[PDB]
């Protein structure tokens, strides 16, 4: 009957066979599988969020955003599997392409030459420009959210924490968070993803998290320990979790020249690094300026860097209402459904 995996149900229909456990992901575990229609081995993640308002929302986003987005650098949802009627749909399977590794695993045991870091950075920014032009924030860019196969192709994924941007809360892992957010505050500006990306670069250069820290004050001081104590217009700036009184009551910290920290890092990468990892969000480099930086000049081509066909535009409804929208949304992948 329905194929089991690690004693767990994984009924994905006769379109996918040969299931192989790979690990965890979120509302459920993740498996590999052979697609009997495309003759490839897609990745399928089981999600069971119908009885959670948080999960339900994080799901709907991930499904709605990806389904509407189409970019070489933004992972795509190849298919979705759920019961014929919302009455039985107790879990959803989102089938996507199977990339070999990801930036987290790679950067951990693997070493990347400068040429690879430059290409990786570019693919990352090229994709970020699309999302950012879509009037959207990823809000969670990190090594483990950048997939890749041996060809060096990179794709951004997981938009369950994304958010719609525009001019005018429980956090796991903080290593890639800008100072303004620090310790539950959720970002609202594209400039936040830049800091994250900046942080991701730093890691590809040393294979080690640029801003570790027992807690947010320890991380905070780790930053200044590198970037040196910021100005007063920089502190008084978007830094106000109140506990900022901490930084205010803190001696002078000097900056560590990037070149010293990264003795084997190219001069161009560092200059751009610096531009991204700036305390004052307002001064952080934007995605378009970055794509045009001397470092990424061998790949730079604004005509090959498409924007969202249309920006992205009500989402705190009760779970059973989200399930409803999660049903309607997944209705296109059902047989003969136009």
């Amino acid at each position: 009957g329905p194929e089991m995996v690690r004693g767990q149900v994984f009924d994905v229909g006769p379109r996918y066979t040969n299931l192989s456990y790979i690990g965890e992901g979120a509302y459920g575990m993740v498996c590999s599988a052979y697609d009997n229609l495309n003759k490839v081995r897609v990745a399928i993640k089981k999600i069971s969020p119908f009885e959670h308002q948080t999960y339900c929302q994080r799901t709907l986003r991930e499904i709605k955003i990806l389904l509407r987005f189409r970019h070489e650098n933004i992972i795509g949802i190849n298919d979705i599997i759920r019961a014929p009627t919302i009455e039985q749909m107790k879990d959803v399977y989102i089938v996507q392409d199977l990339m070999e590794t990801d930036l987290y695993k790679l950067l951990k045991t693997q070493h990347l030459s400068n040429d690879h870091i430059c290409y990786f950075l570019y693919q990352i920014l090229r994709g970020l420009k699309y999302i950012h032009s879509a009037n959207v924030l990823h809000r969670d860019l990190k090594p483990s959210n950048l997939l890749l196969n041996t060809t060096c192709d990179l794709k951004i994924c997981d938009f369950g924490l994304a958010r719609v941007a525009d001019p005018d809360e429980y956090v796991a892992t903080r290593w890639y968070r800008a100072p303004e957010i620090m310790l539950n505050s959720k970002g609202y500006t594209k400039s936040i993803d830049i800091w994250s990306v900046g942080c991701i670069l730093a890691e590809m250069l040393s294979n080690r998290p640029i801003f570790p820290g027992k807690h947010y004050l320890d991380q905070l001081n780790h930053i200044l320990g590198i970037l040196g104590s910021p100005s007063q217009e920089d502190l008084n700036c978007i830094i106000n979790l109140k506990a900022r009184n901490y930084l205010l009551s803190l001696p002078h910290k000097n900056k560590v020249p990037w070149n010293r920290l990264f003795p084997n890092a190219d001069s161009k990468a560092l200059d751009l690094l610096d531009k991204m990892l700036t305390f004052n969000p307002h001064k952080r480099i934007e995605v378009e300026q970055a794509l045009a930086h001397p470092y990424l000049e061998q790949y730079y081509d604004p005509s090959d860097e498409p924007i969202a066909e249309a920006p992205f535009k009500l989402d705190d409804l009760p779970k059973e209402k989200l399930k409803e929208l999660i049903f309607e949304e997944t209705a296109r992948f059902q047989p003969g459904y136009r």
């Binding site: 070489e72 695993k105 790679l106 990347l112 290409y119 196969n149 060096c152 192709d153």
Partner: peptide, 11 residues
Amino acid sequence: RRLQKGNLPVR
């Protein structure tokens, strides 16, 4: 041009 310039066998 096109998606090129890269190679790295991994997990």
